[PDB]
């Protein structure tokens, strides 16, 4: 049916012409084919073998041009015609990748056929200049109260999510995407963040879980999953965030906003290492290449809030770095920490102690500050930062029979600690982040016993909807808590708390 | 610069000697006479099999001069100096290598080209001529440059044809087309 | 909807293996001989366009 | 094979013509590949070991590695100067 | 016309074979005129037979082996002038401020050599500063290199801004803020802030000239940004007689950039994955930064710890050149002290009685001892009790706390931020002030009167205003 | 050693500190294993050394806290006293 | 390896019949269970128990592949599973054996794993 049409389409491809350049493999070993010919080849050009495998041509040497294969050596053998595509590595870019899972090359692995790509743009293109950037002024909400308030995130921004291996590392990230489904629905196209998850060395099963979760929360319809799977070749893995970034530039340049989540650059680092060693390019500190720093900095300079002459748009990024037992002293962590502005340091002890999200906000910081925080949320969360800090410090005064003052702090802290828990894959609207934090800040949850804290939250919210969902809407639209809103809110919180 | 850069690994020093044969320009005819020296090496191969044998030092160089005394002098003083150089570098395994490479440089100066039309099977002589003609009637043989088109038999290179000359080919084989057909009907 | 898509995928693989059957048939025939002549003339027209 | 003045095609080319060092370059050298603060000189066969050589560039060097057919001087002097 | 066809492009190391006759000298600059941009290659070898091995400043992508190259014949030559002040200039020496072609007057090669022994000043002099804390505990030396310590945004930008304003007042100087390993996002902020703080005025005058070398730019251009900036500075020093101050950002990325280029060039990296030619690169740079008779380039450089390993060769090499160290602390900024400088870690190699003045030394030593004892005293003052410890012990705490508050200078750049008008207090006036505080003839003056004041004369007034 | 350790069916680790401690030879059985085990052990000897292992295992932990010099709980010192002997 | 589209992923629950294992880390059919452990901490023994319980219990087949394990252990395993009857030399077995040993050069040790995978 479709097949009759498809065969007709293929039949309609039959034009052929003299190939400007060709190579014939001289020898192929270790995925480093050394090809004889390709005299006028462009550098890093995409090359197509007789096996049809793709490569790029990192080394142009006078005697031989050492292509690096992006695929298997099994199907590659000596004296193999290597047609010269004459096109430097480029990937399709366009609005077609929205709600589409494609492999790195840009082929749909969801098999949703041809991508609606209005350009193919080269994988690497240099970062926007000093004047092509302007300051952040657009919050982005993850739907996690702690993250939105304690670590306020905006758009343009680059901040790590550096923490222990598969502690639902991906889960923390995925939560943001789900809250972003709400914003995406919104017609303001700066609030249409076309999220990109870049699955780097992640098994197809792991990405399968992600895909189904995305389908379930209907998040497939703006998602792009650039997929460099665990089995997929280390050159594909290496170029995978770079390739992905070019897609991101298309949105950003178009003035749109989007969020790209590189997961995990630690394994990206390993792939580049594998490649570099195979090219016999020397090791460097922590047996990682020395220009790994250079690589990472290039990638991260493509996340930027562009000047308004260059369009309002931005790309926001949140690289995920996997910590080998929390060793941020490691070369790849140290480098990234300096390049990025903010870090989120997920605290594994807390994870083990069943606190999900698991974060220590002693070791999370954001340097994109309150120009990435909602004004309302800022007001009611200076206190929150301070209270939790005290709860931490006065923790050890409980680990002894000691003053009522310490005990007051501890209760206020414990209720807050309990409040910032949230079973993963439940995002939250900011207009409901603010009330919960208001109550806690005012210590009205101190009375509420720990078991009833969980119950209180949802009840308070439903109460707010029944009593005055006008208040919630008003909070949302003003974006600032007016004296009148704090007035009404104080009354309301008391009444709910009383029951 | 010699016509066509070989890249010149070892033998490329002798290709630069071919540039010197253009410089003292009787060395162009010296490349014909040095092809006659290669013909003397082609009469040589019982001794050439011994000549791949290592370890002939100054006595090896003298023994090479004895073979040169059996010779009439093809390639002249440049060839004699190459005999000394190759003796000094001690290698008969890149002796004929230099010969082949000098041959490439020589026939590049002459302007002769070598093409090939590998196919699954042999092709008509009518076909041979028609493609040589075609190549002349294309920019590939601009004319001013000769061609030795060799059809090769390689059934492994499946049905249809592949024409090769320069870094330029047309591959209208079966396998590539079948590949494309399959791929799209698996899409 | 799910079954519609699955049925389409099944049809596509059915026609895939039938395509293999046509490939095996063509490579025996002296269409194997006659199409070499065709490629020869096709290459004649192409290369003359240079 | 290994770097030798037979690999060096221009040195080689003079030899294959017939002309050679002819003792001139057994006491003078000519610089080849210079940079990375080492120079590779052809000739200088009468060089004493750890001699001072003066490059015609107003640079002097101490001969370090006396190798078959070549001497690798080490420069008491800057790379920019020498060529 | 010196021309050659590209004969390799293995990485960013491009071998160019030039038509036989043209012998490139090492450190020449080649330009391959490309359709998209230009490409600047710097000849870093002679590979022989009219071939080179070069490094690249810009990305080598899409290059075709055999592209014609033009050899300028020597290092990149960047325009200099007061014209070039207030312009953001890339490594090449071309506008990236997007304010069009910078008015060139003379251009000069980016490579240069340290001034001779004769041209070096035999006596080290002290550069006056307007920050009192700087002028006591780490007085800037003219010509010297002052290595910044502290983390990003601990007040770093504001500290640097203050200095630009001060140098212009102090001497009449100029500056060039060169940013190595510069995040372009951070760079935007700096440029907008600097415009705002009027150290750059695009309509007005600009003391500072900006050279930004982003991290996305190739390691070769990362290595060469510093040399370029220094050439500009030297035009001011030598040829405008100016005392100028040249800021550098991370020297961590000076090392990193140099390391990569060496290893690519095949020069075996020395330990801790660092360049073998590490020392010489700092040597040329930090002996070109010196006091000539004409002028002096003083440089405040920023040192970012490699992994907190000061034992690493690269920090040590840096520290050898440095004449002062300024050790910012956010803890100190949290005690409301702007400047944020940690006084007990504020140290300079010049602090000696002869060098900084006998009085200045004596005052300094006492002020250091006073604070040192105060810190220690404050430990046990807290534990044992203020009044449960000597009158003398709390006297030292009080005297110290008056000094601590006196450190707080609401200076001009941060006038907006503090609110309180700028206080620019000269080195001479600083010494005078500490003498009185040392002689405690103003221990009857509140601690919150010594809070946020200029000189000694000024805090007589602030005590009055509190009362009145 | 790593390659060999994988190959072999046991390790018979010795400790230097324990050599000085007066076991001469000294065998530190913490890192000594015999995967083959007590099928190659005499039945009588299997019986007698049955809880020899348990006592020692307890002793190792107990001894570790015990160096402090405090008067520990008696149950732990039953272990400590037995273990020493 | 099967492509992204060839994946069909859900997790069934294996029951090991070992209480600690079941409660505190239940195993899943299709899973990638990983027995991190030290030398001979009954590493073999644990596997032998799994085969004893789960293999008989389930109707499915198993393939037991030993990559570079000892010929002493090998003789015991063969005999042991002849004894548990999971291997019967007349009559079926719900397991297959591919016994690879460490004396065989490392190249063979690498692709014994691939051999087992193909079965």
Swiss-Prot record, chain A:
Entry-annotated residues carrying Phosphoserine: 14, 135
Keyword Cell membrane attached: no
Pfam family, one: ATP-synt_ab
Gene Ontology molecular functions: ADP binding; ATP binding; proton-transporting ATP synthase activity, rotational mechanism
Subcellular location: Mitochondrion inner membrane
UniProt-listed PROSITE patterns: ATPASE_ALPHA_BETA
GO BP terms in the entry: proton motive force-driven ATP synthesis
Site (described: Required for activity): 364
Entry keyword set: ATP synthesis, ATP-binding, CF(1), Hydrogen ion transport, Ion transport, Membrane, Mitochondrion, Mitochondrion inner membrane, Nucleotide-binding, Phosphoprotein, Transit peptide, Transport
Cellular component terms (Gene Ontology): cytosol; mitochondrial inner membrane; mitochondrial intermembrane space; mitochondrial nucleoid; mitochondrion; proton-transporting ATP synthase complex
Annotated residues for binding of ATP: 163-170
Protein's UniProt keywords contain Nucleotide-binding: yes
InterPro entries: ATP_synth_asu-like_sf, ATP_synth_asu_C, ATP_synth_asu_C_sf, ATP_synth_F1_a_nt-bd_dom, ATP_synth_F1_asu, ATPase_a/bsu_AS, ATPase_F1/V1/A1_a/bsu_N, ATPase_F1/V1/A1_a/bsu_N_sf
Subunit structure: F-type ATPases have 2 components, CF(1) - the catalytic core - and CF(0) - the membrane proton channel. CF(1) has five subunits: alpha(3), beta(3), gamma(1), delta(1), epsilon(1). CF(0) has three main subunits: a, b and c.
Family note: Belongs to the ATPase alpha/beta chains family.
Note: Present with 41500 molecules/cell in log phase SD medium.
Family matches, as PANTHER family: ATP SYNTHASE SUBUNIT ALPHA, MITOCHONDRIAL (PTHR48082:SF2)
Protein name listed in UniProt: ATP synthase subunit alpha, mitochondrial
Species of origin: Saccharomyces cerevisiae (strain ATCC 204508 / S288c)
Curated annotation (Swiss-Prot), chain B:
Xref: NCBIfam families: ATP_synt_delta (TIGR01145)
Family, per entry: Belongs to the ATPase delta chain family.
Statement: the UniProt record of this protein carries the keyword Transport: yes
Entry's Gene Ontology BP terms: proton motive force-driven ATP synthesis; proton motive force-driven mitochondrial ATP synthesis
Lineage, opening ranks: Eukaryota, Fungi, Dikarya, Ascomycota, Saccharomycotina
Protein's name in the database: ATP synthase subunit 5, mitochondrial
Subunit and partners: F-type ATPases have 2 components, CF(1) - the catalytic core - and CF(0) - the membrane proton channel. CF(1) has five subunits: alpha(3), beta(3), gamma(1), delta(1), epsilon(1). CF(0) has three main subunits: a, b and c.
Gene Ontology molecular function terms on file: proton-transporting ATP synthase activity, rotational mechanism
Compartment annotation: Mitochondrion; Mitochondrion inner membrane
PROSITE patterns for the chain: ATPASE_DELTA
Keywords per UniProt: ATP synthesis, Hydrogen ion transport, Ion transport, Membrane, Mitochondrion, Mitochondrion inner membrane, Transit peptide, Transport
Misc. comment: Present with 32400 molecules/cell in log phase SD medium.
Pfam families in the cross-refs: OSCP (PF00213)
InterPro entries found in the cross-reference section: ATP_synth_OSCP/delta_N_sf, ATPase_OSCP/d_CS, ATPase_OSCP/dsu
Gene: ATP5
Gene Ontology cellular-component annotations: mitochondrial inner membrane; mitochondrion; proton-transporting ATP synthase complex
Curated annotation (Swiss-Prot), chain C:
UniProt superkingdom: Eukaryota
UniProt subcellular location: Mitochondrion; Mitochondrion inner membrane
Assigned protein family: Belongs to the eukaryotic ATPase B chain family.
Complex formation: F-type ATPases have 2 components, CF(1) - the catalytic core - and CF(0) - the membrane proton channel. In yeast, the dimeric form of ATP synthase consists of 17 polypeptides: alpha, beta, gamma, delta, epsilon, 4 (B), 5 (OSCP), 6 (A), 8, 9 (C), d, E (Tim11), f, g, h, i/j and k.
Miscellaneous section: Present with 12900 molecules/cell in log phase SD medium.
Function summary: Mitochondrial membrane ATP synthase (F(1)F(0) ATP synthase or Complex V) produces ATP from ADP in the presence of a proton gradient across the membrane which is generated by electron transport complexes of the respiratory chain. F-type ATPases consist of two structural domains, F(1) - containing the extramembraneous catalytic core, and F(0) - containing the membrane proton channel, linked together by a central stalk and a peripheral stalk. During catalysis, ATP synthesis in the catalytic domain of F(1) is coupled via a rotary mechanism of the central stalk subunits to proton translocation.
Protein name stated in the entry: ATP synthase subunit 4, mitochondrial
Protein species of origin: Saccharomyces cerevisiae (strain ATCC 204508 / S288c) (Baker's yeast)
Curated annotation (Swiss-Prot), chain G:
Residues of the full protein shown: 154 to 272 of 511
Modified residues (Phosphothreonine): 84
Other comment: Present with 164000 molecules/cell in log phase SD medium.
Record protein name field: ATP synthase subunit beta, mitochondrial
Record-stated family: Belongs to the ATPase alpha/beta chains family.
Subcellular locations according to the entry: Mitochondrion; Mitochondrion inner membrane
Originating organism: Saccharomyces cerevisiae (strain ATCC 204508 / S288c) (Baker's yeast)
Biological classification of the source: Eukaryota, Fungi, Dikarya, Ascomycota, Saccharomycotina
Signal peptide feature range: none
Binding site for ATP: 37-44
Role according to the record: Mitochondrial membrane ATP synthase (F(1)F(0) ATP synthase or Complex V) produces ATP from ADP in the presence of a proton gradient across the membrane which is generated by electron transport complexes of the respiratory chain. F-type ATPases consist of two structural domains, F(1) - containing the extramembraneous catalytic core, and F(0) - containing the membrane proton channel, linked together by a central stalk and a peripheral stalk. During catalysis, ATP synthesis in the catalytic domain of F(1) is coupled via a rotary mechanism of the central stalk subunits to proton translocation.
Disulfide pattern: none
Description of how the protein assembles with itself and partners: F-type ATPases have 2 components, CF(1) - the catalytic core - and CF(0) - the membrane proton channel. CF(1) has five subunits: alpha(3), beta(3), gamma(1), delta(1), epsilon(1). CF(0) has three main subunits: a, b and c.
């Amino acid at each position: 049916e479709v097949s009759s049409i498809l065969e007709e389409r293929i039949k309609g491809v039959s034009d052929e012409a003299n190939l400007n350049e060709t190579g014939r493999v001289l020898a192929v070993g270790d995925g480093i084919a050394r090809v004889f010919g390709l005299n006028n080849i462009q550098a890093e050009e995409l090359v197509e073998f007789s096996s049809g495998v793709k490569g790029m041509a990192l080394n142009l040497e006078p005697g031989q041009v050492g292509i690096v294969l992006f695929g298997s050596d099994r199907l590659v053998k000596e004296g193999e015609l290597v047609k010269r595509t004459g096109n430097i590595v480029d990937v399709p870019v366009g609005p077609g990748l929205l709600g589409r899972v494609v492999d790195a090359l840009g082929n749909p692995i969801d098999g949703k056929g041809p991508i609606d790509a209005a350009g193919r743009s080269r994988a690497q293109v240099k970062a926007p200049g000093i004047l092509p950037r302007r300051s952040v002024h657009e919050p982005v909400q993850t739907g996690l109260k702690a993250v939105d308030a304690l670590v306020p995130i905006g758009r343009g921004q680059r901040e790590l999510i550096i923490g222990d291996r598969q502690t639902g590392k991906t889960a923390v990230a995925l939560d943001t995407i789900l809250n972003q489904k709400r914003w995406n629905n919104g017609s303001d196209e700066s609030k249409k963040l076309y999220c990109v998850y870049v699955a780097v060395g992640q098994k197809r099963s792991t990405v399968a879980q992600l895909v189904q979760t995305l389908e379930q929360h209907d998040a497939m319809k703006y998602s792009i999953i650039v997929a460099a799977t665990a089995s997929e070749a280390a050159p594909l893995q290496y170029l995978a965030p770079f390739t992905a970034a070019s897609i991101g530039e298309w949105f950003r340049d178009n003035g749109k906003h989007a969020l790209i989540v590189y997961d995990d650059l630690s394994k990206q680092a390993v792939a580049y290492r594998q490649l570099s060693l195979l090219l016999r390019r020397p090791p460097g500190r922590e047996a990682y290449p020395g220009d790994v720093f250079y690589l990472h900095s290039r990638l991260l300079e493509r996340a930027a809030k562009l000047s308004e002459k260059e369009g309002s748009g931005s790309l926001t990024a949140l690289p995920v770095i996997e910590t080998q037992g929390g060793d941020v002293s490691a070369y790849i962590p140290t480098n990234v920490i300096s390049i990025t502005d903010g870090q989120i340091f997920l605290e594994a002890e807390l994870f083990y102690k069943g606190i999900r999200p698991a974060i220590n906000v002693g070791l999370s910081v954001s340097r994109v500050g309150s120009a990435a925080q909602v004004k309302a949320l800022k007001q009611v969360a200076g206190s929150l930062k301070l209270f939790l800090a005290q709860y931490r410090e006065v923790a050890a005064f409980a680990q002894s029979d000691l003053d009522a003052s310490t005990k007051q702090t501890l209760v206020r802290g414990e209720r807050l600690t309990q409040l910032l828990k949230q079973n993963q894959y439940s995002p939250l609207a900011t207009e409901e982040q603010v009330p919960l934090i208001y109550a806690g800040v005012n210590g009205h949850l101190d009375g509420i016993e720990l078991s009833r804290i969980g119950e209180f939250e949802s009840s308070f919210l439903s109460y707010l909807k029944s009593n005055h969902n006008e208040l919630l809407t008003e909070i949302r639209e003003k974006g600032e808590l007016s004296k009148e809103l704090l007035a009404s809110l104080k009354s309301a919180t008391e009444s709910f708390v009383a029951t | 610069p010699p016509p066509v850069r070989l890249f010149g690994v070892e033998g490329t020093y002798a290709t630069a000697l071919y540039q010197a044969a253009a410089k003292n320009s009787s060395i162009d005819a010296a490349f014909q006479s040095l092809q006659k020296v290669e013909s003397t090496v082609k009469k040589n191969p019982k001794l050439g099999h011994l000549l791949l044998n290592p370890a002939l030092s100054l006595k090896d160089r003298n023994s090479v001069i004895d073979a040169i005394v059996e010779t009439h002098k093809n390639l002249d003083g440049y060839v004699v100096n190459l005999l000394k150089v190759l003796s000094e570098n001690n290698r008969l395994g890149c002796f004929e290598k230099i010969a082949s490479d000098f041959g490439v440089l020589n026939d590049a100066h002459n302007g002769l080209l070598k093409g090939t039309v590998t196919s699954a099977e042999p092709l008509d002589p009518k076909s041979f001529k028609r493609i040589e003609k075609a190549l002349s009637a294309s920019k590939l043989v601009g004319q001013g440059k000769s061609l030795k088109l060799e059809n090769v038999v390689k059934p492994e290179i499946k049905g249809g044809l592949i024409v090769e000359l320069g870094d330029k080919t047309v591959d209208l084989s079966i396998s590539t087309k079948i590949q494309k057909l399959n791929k799209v009907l698996e899409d | 909807v799910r079954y519609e898509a699955s049925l389409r995928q099944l049809e596509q693989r059915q026609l895939a293996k039938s395509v293999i059957s046509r490939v095996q048939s063509e490579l025996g025939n002296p269409k194997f001989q006659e199409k070499v002549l065709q490629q020869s003339i096709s290459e004649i027209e192409q290369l003359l366009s240079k | 094979t290994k770097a030798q003045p037979t690999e060096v095609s221009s040195i080689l080319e003079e030899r294959i013509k017939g002309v050679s060092d002819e003792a001139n370059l057994n006491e003078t050298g000519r610089v080849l590949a210079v940079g990375d603060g080492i120079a590779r000189v052809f000739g200088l066969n009468n060089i004493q070991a750890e001699e001072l050589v003066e490059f015609s560039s107003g640079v002097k060097g101490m001969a370090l590695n006396l190798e078959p057919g070549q001497v690798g001087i080490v420069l008491f002097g800057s790379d920019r100067l020498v060529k | 016309p010196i021309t050659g066809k590209v004969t390799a492009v293995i990485g960013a190391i491009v071998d160019v074979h030039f038509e036989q006759s043209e012998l490139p000298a090492i450190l020449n600059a080649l330009e391959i005129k490309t359709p998209q941009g230009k490409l600047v290659l710097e000849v870093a070898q002679h590979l022989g037979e009219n071939t080179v091995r070069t490094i690249a400043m810009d990305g080598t992508e899409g290059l075709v082996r055999g592209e014609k190259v033009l050899d300028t014949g020597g290092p990149i030559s960047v325009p200099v002038g007061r014209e070039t002040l207030g312009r953001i200039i890339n490594v090449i020496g071309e506008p990236i401020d997007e304010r069009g072609p910078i008015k060139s007057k003379l251009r000069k090669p980016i490579h240069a050599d340290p001034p001779s022994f004769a041209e070096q000043s035999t006596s080290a002099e002290i550069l006056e500063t307007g920050i009192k804390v700087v002028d006591l505990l780490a007085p800037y030396a003219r010509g010297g290199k002052i290595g910044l310590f502290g983390g990003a945004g601990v007040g770093k930008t504001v500290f640097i801004q203050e200095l630009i304003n001060n140098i212009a007042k102090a001497h009449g100087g100029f500056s060039v803020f060169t940013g190595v390993g510069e995040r372009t996002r951070e760079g935007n902020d700096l440029y907008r802030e600097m415009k705002e703080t009027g150290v750059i005025n695009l309509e007005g005058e600009s003391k500072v000239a900006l050279v930004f070398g982003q991290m996305n730019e190739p390691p070769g251009a990362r290595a060469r940004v510093a040399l370029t900036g220094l050439t500009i500075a030297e035009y001011f020093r030598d040829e405008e007689g100016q005392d100028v101050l040249l800021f550098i950002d991370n020297i961590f990325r000076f090392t990193q950039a140099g390391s990569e280029v060496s290893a690519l060039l095949g020069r075996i990296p020395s330990a801790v994955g660092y360049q073998p030619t590490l020392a010489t690169d700092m040597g040329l740079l930090q002996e070109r930064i010196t006091t000539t008779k004409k002028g002096s380039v003083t440089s405040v450089q920023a040192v970012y710890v490699p992994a907190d390993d000061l034992t690493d060769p690269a920090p040590a090499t840096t520290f050898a050149h440095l004449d002062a160290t300024t050790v910012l602390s956010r803890g100190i900024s949290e005690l409301g002290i702007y400047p944020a400088v940690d006084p007990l870690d504020s140290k300079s190699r010049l602090l000696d009685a002869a060098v900084v003045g006998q009085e200045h030394y004596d005052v300094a030593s006492k002020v250091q001892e006073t604070l040192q004892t105060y810190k220690s005293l404050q430990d046990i003052i807290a534990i044992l009790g203020m009044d449960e410890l000597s009158e003398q012990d709390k006297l030292t705490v009080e005297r110290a706390r008056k000094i601590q508050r006196f450190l707080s200078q609401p200076f001009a750049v941060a006038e907006v931020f503090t609110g309180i008008p700028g206080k620019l207090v000269r080195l001479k006036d600083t010494v005078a002030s500490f003498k009185a505080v040392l002689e405690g003839k103003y221990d009857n003056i509140p601690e919150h009167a010594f809070y946020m004041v200029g000189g000694i004369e000024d805090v007589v007034a602030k005590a009055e205003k509190l009362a009145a | 050693p790593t390659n060999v350790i994988s190959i072999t069916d046991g390790q018979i680790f010795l400790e230097a500190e324990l050599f000085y401690k007066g076991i001469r030879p000294a065998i530190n059985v913490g890192l000594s294993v015999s995967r083959v085990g007590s099928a190659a052990q005499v039945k009588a000897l299997k019986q007698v050394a049955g809880s020899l292992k348990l006592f020692l295992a307890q002793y190792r932990e107990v001894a570790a806290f015990a160096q402090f010099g405090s008067d520990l709980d008696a149950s732990t010192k039953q272990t400590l006293v037995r273990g020493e002997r």
